[PDB]
Curated annotation (Swiss-Prot), chain B:
Protein name: Polymerase acidic protein
UniProt similarity note: Belongs to the influenza viruses PA family.
Assembly mode: Influenza RNA polymerase is composed of three subunits: PB1, PB2 and PA. Interacts (via C-terminus) with PB1 (via N-terminus).
Location(s), subcellular: Host cytoplasm; Host nucleus
Highest rank taxon of the organism: Viruses
Molecular function, one GO term: metal ion binding
Source organism per UniProt: Influenza A virus (strain A/Northern Territory/60/1968 H3N2) (Influenza A virus (strain NT60))
Entry's EC annotation: 3.1.-.-
Protein function: Plays an essential role in viral RNA transcription and replication by forming the heterotrimeric polymerase complex together with PB1 and PB2 subunits. The complex transcribes viral mRNAs by using a unique mechanism called cap-snatching. It consists in the hijacking and cleavage of host capped pre-mRNAs. These short capped RNAs are then used as primers for viral mRNAs. The PB2 subunit is responsible for the binding of the 5' cap of cellular pre-mRNAs which are subsequently cleaved after 10-13 nucleotides by the PA subunit that carries the endonuclease activity.
GO biological process, one term: viral RNA genome replication
Co-factor(s): Mn(2+)
Keywords: Cap snatching, Endonuclease, Eukaryotic host gene expression shutoff by virus, Eukaryotic host transcription shutoff by virus, Host cytoplasm, Host gene expression shutoff by virus, Host nucleus, Host-virus interaction, Hydrolase, Inhibition of host RNA polymerase II by virus, Manganese, Metal-binding, Nuclease, Phosphoprotein
Cofactor stoichiometry and binding remark: Binds 2 manganese ions per subunit.
UniProtKB/Swiss-Prot annotation, chain C:
Stated name of the protein: Polymerase basic protein 2
Top-level taxon of the source organism: Viruses
Subcellular location field: Virion; Host nucleus; Host mitochondrion
Origin species: Influenza A virus (strain A/Northern Territory/60/1968 H3N2) (Influenza A virus (strain NT60))
Role this protein plays: Plays an essential role in transcription initiation and cap-stealing mechanism, in which cellular capped pre-mRNAs are used to generate primers for viral transcription. Recognizes and binds the 7-methylguanosine-containing cap of the target pre-RNA which is subsequently cleaved after 10-13 nucleotides by the viral protein PA. Plays a role in the initiation of the viral genome replication and modulates the activity of the ribonucleoprotein (RNP) complex.
Subunit structure: Influenza RNA polymerase is composed of three subunits: PB1, PB2 and PA. Interacts (via N-terminus) with PB1 (via C-terminus). Interacts with nucleoprotein NP (via N-terminus). Interacts (via N-terminus) with host MAVS (via N-terminus); this interaction inhibits host innate immune response.
Family affiliation: Belongs to the influenza viruses PB2 family.
From Swiss-Prot, chain D:
Pfam family, one: Flu_PB1
Name by which UniProt lists this protein: RNA-directed RNA polymerase catalytic subunit
Chief location of this protein within or outside the cell: host cell
One GO term (biological process): DNA-templated transcription
Protein function: RNA-dependent RNA polymerase which is responsible for replication and transcription of virus RNA segments. The transcription of viral mRNAs occurs by a unique mechanism called cap-snatching. 5' methylated caps of cellular mRNAs are cleaved after 10-13 nucleotides by PA. In turn, these short capped RNAs are used as primers by PB1 for transcription of viral mRNAs. During virus replication, PB1 initiates RNA synthesis and copy vRNA into complementary RNA (cRNA) which in turn serves as a template for the production of more vRNAs.
Region listing for Disordered, in residue ranges: 50-82
Reactions it catalyzes: RNA(n) + a ribonucleoside 5'-triphosphate = RNA(n+1) + diphosphate
Annotated Gene Ontology cellular component terms: host cell cytoplasm; host cell nucleus
Organism: Influenza A virus (strain A/Northern Territory/60/1968 H3N2)
Amino acid sequence: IKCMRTFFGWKEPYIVKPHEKGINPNYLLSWKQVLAELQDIENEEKIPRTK
Amino acid sequence: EITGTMRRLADQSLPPNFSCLENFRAYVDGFEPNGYIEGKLSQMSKEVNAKIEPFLKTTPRPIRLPDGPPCFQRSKFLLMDALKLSIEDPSHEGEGIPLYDAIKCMRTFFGWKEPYIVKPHEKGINPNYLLSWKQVLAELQDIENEEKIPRTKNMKKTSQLKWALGENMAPEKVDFDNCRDVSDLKQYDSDEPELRSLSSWIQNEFNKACELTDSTWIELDEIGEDVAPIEYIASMRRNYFTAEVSHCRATEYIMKGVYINTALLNASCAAMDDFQLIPMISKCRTKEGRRKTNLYGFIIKGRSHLRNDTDVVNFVSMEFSLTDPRLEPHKWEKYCVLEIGDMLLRSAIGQMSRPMFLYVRTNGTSKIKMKWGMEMRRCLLQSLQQIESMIEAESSVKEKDMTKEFFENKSETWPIGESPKGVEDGSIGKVCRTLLAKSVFNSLYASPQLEGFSAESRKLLLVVQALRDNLEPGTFDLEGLYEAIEECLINDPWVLLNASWFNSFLTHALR
Amino acid sequence: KYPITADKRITEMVPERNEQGQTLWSKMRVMVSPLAVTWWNRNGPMTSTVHYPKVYKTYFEKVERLK
Amino acid sequence: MDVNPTLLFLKVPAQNAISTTFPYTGDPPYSHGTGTGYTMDTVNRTHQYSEKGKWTTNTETGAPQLNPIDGPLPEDNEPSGYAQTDCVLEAMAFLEESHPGIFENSCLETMEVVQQTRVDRLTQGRQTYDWTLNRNQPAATALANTIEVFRSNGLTANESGRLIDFLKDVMESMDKEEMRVNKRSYLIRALTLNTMTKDAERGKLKRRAIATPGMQIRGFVYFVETLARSICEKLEQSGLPVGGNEKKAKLANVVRKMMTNSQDTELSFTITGDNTKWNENQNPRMFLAMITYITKNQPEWFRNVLSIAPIMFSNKMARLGKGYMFESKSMKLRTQIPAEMLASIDLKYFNESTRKKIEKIRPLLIDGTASLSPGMMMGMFNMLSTVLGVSILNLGQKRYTKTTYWWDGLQSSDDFALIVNAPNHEGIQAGVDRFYRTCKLVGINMSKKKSYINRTGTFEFTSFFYRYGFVANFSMELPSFGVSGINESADMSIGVTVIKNNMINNDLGPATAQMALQLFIKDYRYTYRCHRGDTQIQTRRSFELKKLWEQTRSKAGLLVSDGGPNLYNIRNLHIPEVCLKWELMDEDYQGRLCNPLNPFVTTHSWIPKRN
RNA sequence: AGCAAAAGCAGG
């Protein structure tokens, strides 16, 4: 988290490669869930060791 | 719309000679002066008259300091003997909830012997404070090793801490009728406290506290550019000032106090029912490295419900210490010193391996004193205000208007030191440091004794300047000043030392 | 968090989370975060109108006296 | 080696380095305990000061009231508030003879203001005493309280909107025998004045116990103080209403006017000091007499509506406070004892000093609240007392002292600074003893302990210390230099405006004011987390700041609360911030800023959620 | 026990 916090340069997520199978938007929203979960846990909870 | 009843009250309000409002008004409106004042004066007793006297050179005797037991320290945190377990320069992006930075620094040090008391308190119960410290160490290791990283930790209730804060010590409100039958009751023990005598310890603490520490202890950012003249003069004055001040130990006390009081006020406004652990943590940038979070000492805050700001809050304070007690056992009748083993200091030759003791004293500050210890940056500012006032005075008496005339020149122009059969002179650096530390101790040992002394020493010193410049001063009643000073010198060591300083000033000035 | 208060109208213009995901506004009007402000000032409607110096242009006159 | 700041104070001139004896850089001591003991001691002291004076009970009150005036001449140099009204009247007569037309002009100003005034102004006060809850409360609630109780009363002036009719109808229903409170109890309740121990008294050891009045007398004192402000504005010797650098110059001007020594065959000394017991040894009777003389040849109704203040000064029953809190030693139990029963309790539970105080006051207790009117109320901004005492200084016009020596100077509410001349130390001693006597014959008591005297050139007054030509001042200490706590838009503005006010009025040098702004912006950023864009410090927000900071076109032209730099300095403080940045900003940012689409309206402004 | 003072806290 400290290292991800170090980097700035995050544009909006839009897919660049068509998977051609499966569903690309769903993986986009997965990544979104990741970032949101990480910021939300660390900013405003009692520091869980593993999330 | 007077309604007459006000005319009744009015006619009763007047002097005895006149019994009505209307006769009064007619007398005044029909009044003229007839030189009554001279008849009044000649009529008067000659006893009632203020007779001047020559406030002579040899008249003002040395103010006698009170006598009694030795003066004892009461600061919320010791000042010279404390030490700080560094963090060794962490990164710049990693923020830290302060407990973990502290724990990291306590984790850095090894040299913990078994705890056994070194100073008999002579009151209270020393073993209980020992076991309090034990609870602290155990709680800290236990939380951090095997729990989900709590941001802030509040201790567990025990015999030790609950004794040292007296959650049972409270009596309870009751009505009058149920207790009037009792005869044990008293209004309160509202009386003067025990006298105290000056001693040498506070002087040593001050001397150490004016001295230069090594680090920088304060940064300062940028502001809009400088075009007009007065802007440049302000800029150079403040730059000189902060550069001279930053390497103080006074400024160290400043940031330490500010962080301590902010933490305590955050806690108390945010947490009352819970014994809290807090560090005496302070952020200092190394002169040559990164930001350093120093761990001065742990705190065990006691429960704090502040129905009014004036109310006291009590707690316990642990600040580490190298220098042994029993060299100056008068300085503390209040501490409870433990032994915590050795710390392996490195001198130029060999290794010192001095023991390590801990001063787990108890205390209680306030809400108010916490606020005013938060606002000591104002006190630094006030020292600047004073120096600038001095320089503007010297600019009014001499049109040179030269700040640079004093700020940097190597010129012995300022005495602040008294030596055996000598007086030392220093530069503006030492004096800015000293004025600052004086104001900081004013902020630490603020007490009505100080304010009384300040007014009275102010008036007498003003008279003494009036005397020394041959301005034929006079004073009607002088022993009133002396007794009132002696009234205000009750017990406060800082007050006492300002008084001994006044004394030796009278002597070396010779007025 | 969430010091600032503001209406529900903002909810349409701006998202509930930014690129990092940290939140700008949440319900129990909606509480808004200070980050929400600095998201406006990076991206928002740009308009060259000079109506707001209706009275704020007065202070510029006082600065022309200085410079 | 030992160390001392007293020896830098040895060499250095005292008045320039005087601030070193200004230790107030830390919290004032305050009074943890109920002031009631200090109140009792003050009342004991003033009633001891006038013990020679007879007293007679007031009608319908049951209360002894002492009238010191026409008392004897004092016996000993120990102070005592004994005066003679004739002194006051001849003083005012010499004053008007000196300053012709000043009285009538100030009177006409009082007429036009009372005709134009409105009730809406008084309510913007602080802690006027309400009578319902019997406790000091805010002024808006106070005004609501009185207008509603008046709506219940038969009067209708709260609907009028004017103010003197309001005071008149206050008086009318005040003369009523019932509201649910009988006439005697109601007149004791209206004249009541909370005790309310002094807080922040800097420069003492024990406490003054400032007592404060209620709203109903507040308008009367407002009118008479408006008269006093007018007459003192037309005066040249007042110190209170004159202020700032004009006051600073007035000090220097009077010493100029009197220090010029034509035919200087005479030595000269120039007293300063502090007139002890100012709020005690004075009296409202002299004030009423002054008032009657001041509005000579005027509308009678104005005479009455401006004489009503000193009379209710002339009879007042202030409270004592909370009471005490007794405690058991063995059983360890405590309780508060409201002192309303103090006129019943035995004299054994108490402390001995306390005991003797009680028996001194216990006769002087009616409804439990102490009655007294030989002495002024502690800590009012009267300033008609300055109008009094300045007349003494006016007597030292050589026409009227009618001798070789003569005094003059200025005098604020408690400080005073005479300037005399006489051919020798003996003549100056003669004239100053004459002055001290005179000043006591009017009932003003110059202390002999904490005062002094010197050659011309150096003299204190109101802390505006005046060495030969230098006029250093330490009137009020710097306050806080921290955020106001509202929003990132106006908190900065409020801070800068406060800094500007305290550099323009007081002696905040710019050298400290830049540093003050520096601490202020540090606190601003550390509170709202919003450090510079181009930095390395971390927080919640710093993402968007490091984002926008590259997003821009003009980098330094940014508001500070979003990554911006602070271009303020002592040149450009009155202006706001975005005026200084506006045309240094590009249209994207400026368009995002001033836009009605913002819920913020000024987009940085907002309302925080209550807590 | 302590804080700090010519009176209060040591929770309601």
